[PDB]
C-alpha cells in the first residue's frame, strides 16, 4: 500500500474536482487571461497578505522551484540550500541545469540552517574567479519534517537580506507548517522574496504556485515559465484547483488533519519502543528501523529510506489518511 509513501500518493479532495467541473463550460481565453486565474491569484495573494505580489502557476513543485531560482540568477551567481533540500537531492539537478549556477549546500539540523553558516559561506566571494552569492533557498516545513519557528524564519530571512541575498522558500508543505504553528502564512515564510506554494501534496491533482513578493528581482520569470513548458493553455483548470482548495480555509484544514495523523503515527511508534530520527513537527514521521523490521513492513507498506547509509524510514500522512490506516501500519510493525 502507498498510504504512507508520500502525501503525493493521496488522491484529490472532492472540492478540487468540483471546481474543475464548475469552470468546464464554454470557451475561455488561454494562457491565464481568464477570470478564474485572476480569482485564484487574488486568493493566494490574500492568504499571504502580499497584495503587491505576482502569482504564477506551475504543474509540479520541482517546476515551481526551478522557475523561482532560475529567474533569480545569472549563471555566474551562487545558490545556497540546506544539505537535505529537495532542489539539491530530488530534482535530478533541474535547478542547476536551468540556472547554469552552482548550488551550494549548507550544513543543517534536519533542514534548519543557522544564519552563521550562511554568513560563513558567503564571506569574501567578490573576485571575478568566484561564483557570486545571490539567493538562499529554505524549506518550510523542511524535508526532514521540522518547522522553522516564527522567530527563526524571520531571523534567517532578515540576516540573509542584510548580506545582500534574496530568499526563496520551498513551501511544498507550507500549509503543514502554517497549521502546526497556528500563525499567519506570511509569518510562516518570514519576508521571503519568492515562495513555491505547494498544492499537489495538500489535496490537488497537480499544481504548485509561485508567489513573487518582490517582482523587481525576478525579471523574465514569465519567460522562464514559458520556456520549460509550464504555462498552461487551459489555465482555468490549474487555477480552479487552487480556488477550490483555498475556498473557505479548506487548505489549512487538510494540512491540520495530515499533521494530526502524523502525530498519531509518531506516538504509536514511540509506544512500540522505537526511536524517532527527527521530531514530528509536521506531517512526516522519520523513525529508526532495523533491516528486518523494515523489510517486513515493506511487504505491506511502501515507505521511503531517504538516506541509504542510515536505518531511518519515512512515513508521510495526507488529508485523506485515516486513523485505521495509521493503526494498521503500526500493527504491521509489531
Amino acid at each position: 500500500s502507498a498510504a504512507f509513501a508520500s502525501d503525493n500518493a493521496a488522491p484529490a479532495h472532492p472540492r478540487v474536482l468540483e471546481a474543475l467541473h464548475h469552470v468546464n463550460q464554454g470557451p475561455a481565453p488561454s494562457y491565464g487571461d481568464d477570470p478564474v486565474t485572476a480569482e485564484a491569484a487574488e486568493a493566494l495573494r490574500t492568504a499571504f497578505e502580499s497584495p503587491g505580489a505576482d502569482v504564477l502557476f506551475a504543474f509540479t513543485g520541482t517546476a515551481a522551484n526551478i522557475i523561482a531560482l532560475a529567474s533569480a540568477v545569472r549563471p555566474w551567481h551562487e545558490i545556497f540550500c540546506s544539505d537535505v533540500a529537495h532542489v539539491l537531492v530530488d530534482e535530478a539537478g533541474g535547478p542547476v541545469r536551468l540556472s547554469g549556477a552552482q548550488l551550494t549546500r549548507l550544513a543543517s539540523d534536519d533542514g534548519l540552517i543557522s544564519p552563521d553558516e550562511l554568513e560563513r559561506r558567503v564571506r569574501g566571494r567578490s573576485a571575478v574567479h568566484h561564483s557570486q552569492p545571490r539567493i538562499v533557498s529554505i524549506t518550510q516545513s523542511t524535508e526532514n519534517g521540522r518547522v522553522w519557528s516564527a522567530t527563526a524564519v524571520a531571523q534567517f530571512v532578515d540576516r540573509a537580506h542584510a548580506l545582500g541575498l534574496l530568499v526563496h522558500v520551498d513551501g511544498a508543505r507550507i500549509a503543514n507548517a502554517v497549521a502546526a504553528l497556528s500563525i499567519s502564512p506570511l509569518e510562516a515564510i518570514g519576508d521571503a522574496d519568492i515562495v513555491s506554494v505547494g498544492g499537489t501534496k495538500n489535496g490537488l491533482m497537480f499544481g504548485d504556485a509561485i508567489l513573487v513578493r518582490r517582482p523587481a528581482h525576478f525579471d523574465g520569470i514569465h519567460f522562464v515559465q514559458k520556456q520549460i513548458g509550464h504555462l498552461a493553455s487551459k489555465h482555468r483548470f490549474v487555477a480552479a484547483q487552487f480556488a477550490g482548495l483555498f475556498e473557505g480555509g479548506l487548505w489549512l484544514r487538510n494540512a491540520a488533519h495530515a499533521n494530526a495523523m502524523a502525530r498519531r503515527l509518531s506516538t504509536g511508534l514511540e509506544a512500540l519502543g522505537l526511536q524517532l530520527a527527527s521530531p514530528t513537527e509536521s506531517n512526516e514521521v522519520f523513525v529508526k528501523l532495523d533491516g528486518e523490521a523494515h523489510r517486513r513492513l515493506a511487504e505491506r507498506y511502501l515507505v521511503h529510506q531517504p538516506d541509504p547509509g542510515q536505518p531511518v524510514v519515512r512515513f508521510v500522512c495526507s488529508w485523506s489518511t485515516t486513523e485505521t490506516e495509521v493503526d494498521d501500519a503500526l500493527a504491521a510493525l509489531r
Copy 2:
C-alpha cells in the same frame, strides 16, 4: 468570444472528467508506477501500432516538444524545423535553451517541407567547426492548417533517415490529420522516431504525450522530463485523461467534429466572397482580412494574426464547436 481563438480555448470533454473521478480513490504509487499509467501507455502504443515504443506524459505540448528534441541531441548537434514551426516561433526558444543546440528553419509551403530543402541544408557539415545535423521536426497537421499526405510524410521521413537523421513529429493536432486523411495514425506519421501526441487541444484538460518509437536514440529522456518538472507525482490523473480520450475512438470523433466545423466555416466564408490564405485541410481556417475588417471582427470574436506582415487571421474549431457558433462567426464576417 474566444470560441475560435484556438482549440485550446475549448473546455474538456465530459469523458475526461469522468476518468478523473474514476481514478480519484485510495492512495496510488507516484510518478507513473501505477496501473492507469500502464493502461494509457498501452492505449497510445496500440493506436500508433508501435508495440516497441516507450510512452512519456508531459503537461503541455511545449514540454512534449522540448523533451523529445533535447533528448535527441547534444549541444553541438543541429535541429531542423519548418519556418512556421511552433518550436521555432511560439515556445520562447525553449527547445534551443534546453538542448543547447541551434534550431535551423527550412523554407516550407504552409509547413510542408520539401525533402530537397532538408538535404541542401544538411550537406557538407562534417567539420569540427559546424553544428552537426541530427534531427528534423515536422508538424502534422501543420501550424498553417495543412496535412502531410501519407505519401509525402513517408518520403520526407525516408529522406531524413537515408541521410542518417532522426525525425520528430509535433502531433499537437495529430488527431485532426488522422481524421482528415482517413488513414491509420502510423500512416499519418510515416515511420518517425519520436512523436508529440496532442491531448490538450483535442479535449483533454491538460496533457501531451511522447511516443518514443526508437528508444535507443533518446537515452536519458526520462531524466530530461524530470529536470524540467514534467514528471507528475499524481501521474494517475494525466494518464486517466489519455486512457479515457483514446477509449473506443473518441479522440478521432472529437477531431472529426472539429474538422467538420472548420469545413462549415471555410466553405461559408468562401460563400461570403472572402478568400482563404491556405486550404482548410484540418481544423484551422486562415482567411485574408485587412486591418479594419479585423478590428471590426475583433469586437465579437478573438482571433489571432499569426504573421504581422500578412493580413491573414486564424479561426480554429474544436471538439465542442457548434454549428450555431460557426454561423454566428459567418454573420460577423459578412
Copy 3:
C-alpha cells in the same frame, strides 16, 4: 601549400615576437592587473576613438564573439545575424550554447543585410510565447569578403537602435575593412555597442579583443569571460601582442598589404577568364571553379569551399603574402 587557406595560416609578425620578448622579465600580477594590459586597452580605445569603452582580451575570434553575444542576452532573448555569419556557420553553435538564445539568420547580399529585413524579422514579437529580439550581429568586413560602406553601416546601426536592439560587430577582419575604406575605425563600425576586434588574422600569434563601447548593456561580461576559460593568468602576453601590432598604425599597414595582394590575385583570376562569386572588396577572393580545375588546384594549394552546393572556392591573403605566391597560384590555374 597553405598560403591562401586563410589569413590565420600566416605566421606572427616580427613586432609581435619582439613585444613578447620585451615583457618577458620579472614577475607580474596576473589576470590583467598589470601595466601592459592597461597600455593595450588604451591603444584599442584610442584607435576606435571610444574613451568610455571597456576592453577585454580573449584567445580566439570565436571566444570574442561568444563572450560579447552571451553577455548581451538572457536565454529568452533573440540574436540576429546574416545567413553567412561566422557565429551561425563556423563556431559549432557556441554562441547559441552559451547564450541559451535562438540565433536567427537574416537574408543578405554577401553578408550585407538590408535594414528592412531586420525590421521585418523583429516586428510583433512582444508576447510571452516569443523569443525577445535583443541584438543583431554584423560582420565587417563580411565573411563573403565585402565591406559595409560608412553610410550603410551607420544606417543599419541607426535602424537597429531605433528598434530597441543592440549591435555587435564581428571585426575579425576589421583592419581590412578600415584599410579598404580609408576611413576611421569608428566610422567603419558605425556606433555599434560592442565589437570583436581581430588580432589573430592580422598577424598576432593569438588574441582577439572585445571593445565594449556601452558597458551598461553587457553586465557580467567579465564573469562570462572567466567562465569559459578566456581570462589569461599571464595576461601581459596577450596584451603585449596587441600593443605591438597597433603601435604606429602597423595593424592597418598589414591589412592594406593583405588587401593589395587580394586585388592582385582577383584581377589575375578575372584576366584568366574566371568569374568572381563576390566582388573583392577586402582580403578574400571568391571565385567560381569547375570540379576539374578545383581538384587540380587542390593538389598544389589548400583552399576552402564555403558552400558545398556551389562551385566556389576561397583564397585569403595575409600580411605576409607575396606577389610571387599570388603569381604562382595564377600560374597553377592555367
Copy 4:
C-alpha cells in the same frame, strides 16, 4: 612584488620563446593539422606512457578542466570534487555552467579525499529523481599544496572505477607532484581517465593540455573545445610551447626548482616560529599569520588568502624564483 603571488606570475622560460621563434616561418595549416601539433601530442603521450591517449590543447587551466568535465557528462549526471578544488571555488562555476551538471564537494584533508567519502556520497543514487554519479575530479598536487602518494592515488582511482565512475586529474601542477615524488607521471596520476596537464604555471606563456587516456568515454570533446573558443587557428604556437617544455626533461627541472625554493621558504618560516597550515610537499607554502604581520607583509609582497575565515596566507614558488627572493621575503617577515 608578485614574486610569490602565484607560479602564473612568473615569466616564460627562454626555451619557450625559442620554440615560438622556430615554428614562426611560412604558412601552416590551421586548427592543429600541422606537424608541430603532432610532435607535441606525441611528447605528452610519451611523458605519461599512454600511447592510446588523445591530446587536446587549450589556452588556460580553467578551460582544460571545463572541457574535460563537460565532455564526460550529460546534465543529469553528477560531478564530484574536493572541498578545495579549483573547479569548485576559482572558475566562477564554469564547469557547472558548461556541463549543466551538479558539482558535489567532498570532505578532504588538504585536498586528499578518502575513498570511503566518495563511496558514501555515491551510494543509492539510482532513481530518476537523483543526479547520476559519473565522474570525480582530484587535483595533483592539491590546491592546498599536498601530493597524493603513488599508493593513495592508485587506491582512489581503483575505488572510483569499482563504483563505475570516471576520474579526472587536475594536474595544473602535476610537474611539481612528479618532481616531489620521484615517480613516473603515469604513476603520479594513477590510471586516471582524463588529465588536465599544466603548462602555464610551469614556465609556458599560455597553454594547458588535455590528455584523454580513455577517449571512448569523452565522445564529442573536440566539439566542446570548439564551442568555447579554445581550438586555436594558429595551433603551431601552443604546440611548440609544449614540445619545447617537455624536451629533455626541462619541465621536471623547472618543477624541481620551484619545489626546492618552496622548501627553502617553508623551512625558513618554521625557523621563524611561524606555523604551517599545511605541510609543504610541493611548490606552495601555506602559513598562519596574524593580522598585524599579514598587513606588514602585504605592503611588500603580494600573497593570496584562500579562506577569508582563516588567518592563512599562501606563497607560491616558480621556475624563476631565486634564493635571494626567498631570503628577502623571510627577512621581511622578521
